[PDB]
Amino acid sequence: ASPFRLASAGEISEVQGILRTAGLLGPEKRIAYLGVLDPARGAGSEAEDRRFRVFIHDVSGARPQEVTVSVTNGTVISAVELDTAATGELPVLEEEFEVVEQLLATDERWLKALAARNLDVSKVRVAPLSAGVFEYAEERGRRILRGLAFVQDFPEDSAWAHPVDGLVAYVDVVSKEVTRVIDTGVFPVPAEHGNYTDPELTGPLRTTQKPISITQPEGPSFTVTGGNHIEWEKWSLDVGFDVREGVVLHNIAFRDGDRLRPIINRASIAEMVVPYGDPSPIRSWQNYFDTGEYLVGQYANSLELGCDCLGDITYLSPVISDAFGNPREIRNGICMHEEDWGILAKHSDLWSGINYTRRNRRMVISFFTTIGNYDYGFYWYLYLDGTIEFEAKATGVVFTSAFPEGGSDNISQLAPGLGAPFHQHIFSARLDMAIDGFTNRVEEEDVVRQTMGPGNERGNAFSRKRTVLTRESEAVREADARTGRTWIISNPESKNRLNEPVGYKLHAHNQPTLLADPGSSIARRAAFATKDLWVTRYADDERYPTGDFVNQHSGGAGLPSYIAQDRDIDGQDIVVWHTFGLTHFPRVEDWPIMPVDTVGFKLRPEGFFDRSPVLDVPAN
Amino acid sequence: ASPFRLASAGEISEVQGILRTAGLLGPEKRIAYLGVLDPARGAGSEAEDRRFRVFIHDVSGARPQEVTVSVTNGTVISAVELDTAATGELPVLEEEFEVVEQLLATDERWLKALAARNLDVSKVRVAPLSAGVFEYAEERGRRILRGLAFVQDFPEDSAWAHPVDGLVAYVDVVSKEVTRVIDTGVFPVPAEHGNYTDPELTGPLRTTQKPISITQPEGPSFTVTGGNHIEWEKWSLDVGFDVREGVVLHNIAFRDGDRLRPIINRASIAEMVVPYGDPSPIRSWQNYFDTGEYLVGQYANSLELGCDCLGDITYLSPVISDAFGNPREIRNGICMHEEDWGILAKHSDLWSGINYTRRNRRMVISFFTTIGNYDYGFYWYLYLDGTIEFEAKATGVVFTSAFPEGGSDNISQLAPGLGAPFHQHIFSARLDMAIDGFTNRVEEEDVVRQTMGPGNERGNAFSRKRTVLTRESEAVREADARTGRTWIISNPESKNRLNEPVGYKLHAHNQPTLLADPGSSIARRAAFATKDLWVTRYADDERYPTGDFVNQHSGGAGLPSYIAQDRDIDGQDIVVWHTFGLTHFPRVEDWPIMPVDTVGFKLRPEGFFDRSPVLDVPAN
Ligand SMILES: [Cu+2]
Ligand SMILES: [Cu+2]
């Protein structure tokens, strides 16, 4: 049916069959990534050709391959062998995570380190984390994971409360070798537990909370069609799901009268980096590229009706591939519902005697994922007035360390002896713009203050200025909250009734961007995170701000390489990459479990409509 | 029994009785402002002396007075006569607004202007606006209003769609004389109607919106006692209502185990200025001090159940005084309710096998007011985790003008020939801090980036710095979104278990502040609006950032004057004044009626608690 439909179990199995038939998926092969490709640029194009891209790992150590297959035609479109030391390692496999603790349990250097701290190896959990790229020449071309230890006293114990500082081990997950065990010194292992489910900690539970019942007597106002096609209050879109990116929104459009007007072709969080700012050798290499290295969609939670998603919910259970190419369903991994959103518009007019009040509501599409200690919710919102918004919700358990005796400039104390290294959670939203079609441009709009004098004798005048970003070389922009800087994406060939190019304005939160020194490994690997806004000329192979292979990959790919092409973006098929994140100095209130913190951005119509698009909203 | 209870109708009548009896409420006397006084600083107030402050205007031009009466004793504590040319005029009375149109209607110059435009005087509505202080020496000591004309074709017609540009009149509302009629030239009066209730404009109403019902089977979780005392999820506070400020929150405190710990002594929006940035002489004087000149509580709307406030609502119907001292109730002028706020905390732990999810909730206390064309919702939120938030929602009908032939650098076009002068809506939240009591201090916290090198060889380290504001002369701060600047209010004498002063962190939205030239009258009169954060030593007579008598004051009153005292604020009874607002370049989408736009700020506990305060929240 629709070329934007979710991948089905059958398609996944068929991709497996095709790879096998091609001799690309024997018993030592593992699917490190599998996702359906979006239809090529066409108004429908030459019939349906569902293509899937696959990253194939080889557990024997042979070179991996990147393969595109047409599940429709039963063919391999292309299959290229990868030189990982050059272009990057494939995403980490789940099975490789499990390897780390096991191998370390029998390494004598590790056992010696644990013995030095009087810790029973059977109780030492190991957080197997991405390695990144540092000064270890022996790691080039190899698949490494760095392990950090946490003591788990009993089964239901939260090990995060017990970091074993001063110790870190590097592990080759293919050759199954412990390459290095670093011990900088013994640190007391924080003893207080952080068992938020333990009555000893929680105390008696509140009996003061009365029920809040959110019901929809006649069912929701949106319709789901073709499995993932949503239609709600003039909006139209397809809810896609990729194992790397998670929920992806396709063909976001608004029915203005009789015409379905496109706004955003594709919206996704293309990368998510969580850099740590503790200069201790034990953690100074810690940088989670949750999307790029771990693949957030792979870890999407099954949402429970009641507490995860309240109200009348319609779920999607996306299917992904397991490491062997078999389809695996994430039951209720996506929540879809509409929620009341207060007042939309209100005016009590003295002169006419008319009092008008209308309520707002928003369509919500979300999913939650778990990356070890942290859990992140991705929420996309569509409002009646045409506003589009994304909201990331960060919760879970903060990553701990020991709190240094003489305090720390890069770690905060959460409990006695317990520290929490400073870090950030930075996202990159990739917005493949289609403001009334593909001919778009971006203007940076700043408020302009004026000097009191001729023509402004009372010094009350203030203006605004817009600068068209014409070439990619001049499209890497930074925020300026002080001048109320925003970016407008317009279609220079599509004017509203007032003869102005229709547009949408992007409102950023203006949070700090990547803090790391510009010469650091992380600044180069997460170069996108150093600037608030990037605009590129669309290209089918420019998908992530960090490139296709982030795992242990240096700089050289991603946005910085794309921008160098210096392509024309003035009234062309363009892509907006917005960097936005949280800078965290963990508080005691964040321990034992972090209350949700949020960050996001939104786009509001800017002369897109000919007047307010909510005049037809009923009293209700 | 509570000295924070809302004024009763009877108490208003009592003030009236007292005033007339003392011969202070004669036939020519008018009450321009009346409000109960907050209890003074007194640890154990046993003798309750309920006092009211009243601003008495004299329609005969005789000097007005500031009078303080004790409703308890039935006496006049004070009665001071005011030299308005020195200390500003009193707030405008509704009757004075009314007289403007009437007066102009018989003025030759006005009728001449209307005749030239072929406008029927009976159809011309006049927006009677505050005058400010400009170059008209003859206005000093006089009560002036400036009127702008709008054509109302019929009774249920929206006059805002038809501004009459090139025309403005100045009226002395006491002598009832038209002091000036300025006609800079004819401008076509915009012809299209903006009648958002007209099916011709709305088209057929949506039938797609299914109902979303929010109910509470067992009623609300908050208790209202003593008429306005709220207890909800460990929070404790008193909801007051003043005619100038509107909803005012008193004694915000959180029950941490045994102790009821104070956080904010008093929270209010102490001023809200809407300055216009159109240099045209027709509007270059336009600056609404909604709170100070118009009194926002006076115009509070009677909210409708199911319309303005959905769910299980508990209303307060505050009473205010009219111009003659008679009590007038604003039925259902305040909404109180708790609403679901999604996920509070969530973590699915692999190691313990424990999947934990908790819902968030916020207590909402709000009111809506109408200032002519615009309508503003003021919302205060209290969250389960101890977060306090304020949100202002701006709606209504934008103030119009003609859109100049050839465009404009200071006005945007909404409809054919219809203009919308650029302007801002800037608020001042006055937060009389009481973090664990009154001994407080404020620190400005900036993110600190570090250079790669010794101690930071991987260039990943990032820190933060805090600067204590010790004196008022260094307590006028600006935003720095770039460095993630925030301001922490702590009690240096109250420490948490980790031996650090308890605190709360104010997170500003970092919107632009007042854009007007620094030498402008509006910069001088609304100086508070030029900076994001101010900290002053508490003083009972320092209530408004703009001073007590804002109307036609020359400038420098309020904040800049208080700050000039240069008092000690390092560990003293202090008050935080946060400036925040929306910079508006009206869009076509804001016409004919503006969809809600928002601004706010919030404060989060910062080492205030010893661990998460929401560990006892039940699973539901
Ligand atoms: Cu964090
Ligand atoms: Cu506005």
PDB file of N, CA and C in Angstrom, chain B residues 24 71 108 124 224 320 336 341 395 401 418 420 435 449 498 518 532 581 609:
ATOM      1  N   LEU B  24     -13.692  61.323  54.048  1.00  0.00           N
ATOM      2  CA  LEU B  24     -12.742  61.119  52.964  1.00  0.00           C
ATOM      3  C   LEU B  24     -13.379  60.540  51.703  1.00  0.00           C
ATOM      4  N   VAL B  71      -9.621  47.965  59.321  1.00  0.00           N
ATOM      5  CA  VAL B  71     -10.989  47.497  59.311  1.00  0.00           C
ATOM      6  C   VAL B  71     -11.305  46.845  60.660  1.00  0.00           C
ATOM      7  N   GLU B 108     -14.825  69.541  17.583  1.00  0.00           N
ATOM      8  CA  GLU B 108     -14.776  69.929  16.180  1.00  0.00           C
ATOM      9  C   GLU B 108     -13.635  69.311  15.403  1.00  0.00           C
ATOM     10  N   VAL B 124     -17.621  55.062  15.568  1.00  0.00           N
ATOM     11  CA  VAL B 124     -16.230  55.133  15.933  1.00  0.00           C
ATOM     12  C   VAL B 124     -15.990  54.903  17.410  1.00  0.00           C
ATOM     13  N   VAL B 224      -9.050  22.785  50.388  1.00  0.00           N
ATOM     14  CA  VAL B 224      -9.137  24.232  50.506  1.00  0.00           C
ATOM     15  C   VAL B 224      -9.784  24.473  51.864  1.00  0.00           C
ATOM     16  N   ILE B 320     -13.669  42.777  44.976  1.00  0.00           N
ATOM     17  CA  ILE B 320     -12.858  43.975  44.827  1.00  0.00           C
ATOM     18  C   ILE B 320     -13.792  45.162  45.123  1.00  0.00           C
ATOM     19  N   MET B 336      -8.826  26.517  40.440  1.00  0.00           N
ATOM     20  CA  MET B 336      -7.907  25.712  41.187  1.00  0.00           C
ATOM     21  C   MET B 336      -8.189  24.274  40.851  1.00  0.00           C
ATOM     22  N   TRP B 341       0.452  15.289  34.686  1.00  0.00           N
ATOM     23  CA  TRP B 341       1.572  15.881  33.992  1.00  0.00           C
ATOM     24  C   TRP B 341       2.545  14.816  33.449  1.00  0.00           C
ATOM     25  N   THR B 395      -3.488  35.998  24.546  1.00  0.00           N
ATOM     26  CA  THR B 395      -4.490  35.825  23.526  1.00  0.00           C
ATOM     27  C   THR B 395      -5.169  37.152  23.278  1.00  0.00           C
ATOM     28  N   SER B 401      -3.274  48.847  13.170  1.00  0.00           N
ATOM     29  CA  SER B 401      -2.962  50.131  12.581  1.00  0.00           C
ATOM     30  C   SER B 401      -3.142  49.911  11.086  1.00  0.00           C
ATOM     31  N   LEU B 418      -4.166  46.125   6.536  1.00  0.00           N
ATOM     32  CA  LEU B 418      -4.198  46.037   7.986  1.00  0.00           C
ATOM     33  C   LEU B 418      -2.816  45.794   8.579  1.00  0.00           C
ATOM     34  N   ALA B 420      -0.054  45.700  12.106  1.00  0.00           N
ATOM     35  CA  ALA B 420       0.076  45.261  13.494  1.00  0.00           C
ATOM     36  C   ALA B 420       1.435  45.763  13.950  1.00  0.00           C
ATOM     37  N   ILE B 435      13.583  30.813  51.326  1.00  0.00           N
ATOM     38  CA  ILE B 435      14.162  29.450  51.211  1.00  0.00           C
ATOM     39  C   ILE B 435      14.524  28.986  52.628  1.00  0.00           C
ATOM     40  N   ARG B 449      33.486  26.546  30.625  1.00  0.00           N
ATOM     41  CA  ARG B 449      34.176  25.665  29.690  1.00  0.00           C
ATOM     42  C   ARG B 449      35.647  25.651  30.091  1.00  0.00           C
ATOM     43  N   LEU B 498      24.349  16.858  52.978  1.00  0.00           N
ATOM     44  CA  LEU B 498      25.683  16.843  52.402  1.00  0.00           C
ATOM     45  C   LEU B 498      26.396  18.123  52.730  1.00  0.00           C
ATOM     46  N   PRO B 518      17.826  53.096  25.407  1.00  0.00           N
ATOM     47  CA  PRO B 518      18.000  53.336  26.846  1.00  0.00           C
ATOM     48  C   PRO B 518      17.576  54.722  27.338  1.00  0.00           C
ATOM     49  N   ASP B 532      17.130  41.076  33.152  1.00  0.00           N
ATOM     50  CA  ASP B 532      16.389  39.852  33.459  1.00  0.00           C
ATOM     51  C   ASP B 532      16.174  39.561  34.904  1.00  0.00           C
ATOM     52  N   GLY B 581       9.415  38.193  28.992  1.00  0.00           N
ATOM     53  CA  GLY B 581       8.312  38.523  28.114  1.00  0.00           C
ATOM     54  C   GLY B 581       8.415  37.997  26.696  1.00  0.00           C
ATOM     55  N   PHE B 609      16.280  19.440  49.066  1.00  0.00           N
ATOM     56  CA  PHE B 609      15.922  18.201  49.728  1.00  0.00           C
ATOM     57  C   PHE B 609      17.170  17.342  49.930  1.00  0.00           C
TER      58      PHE B 609
END
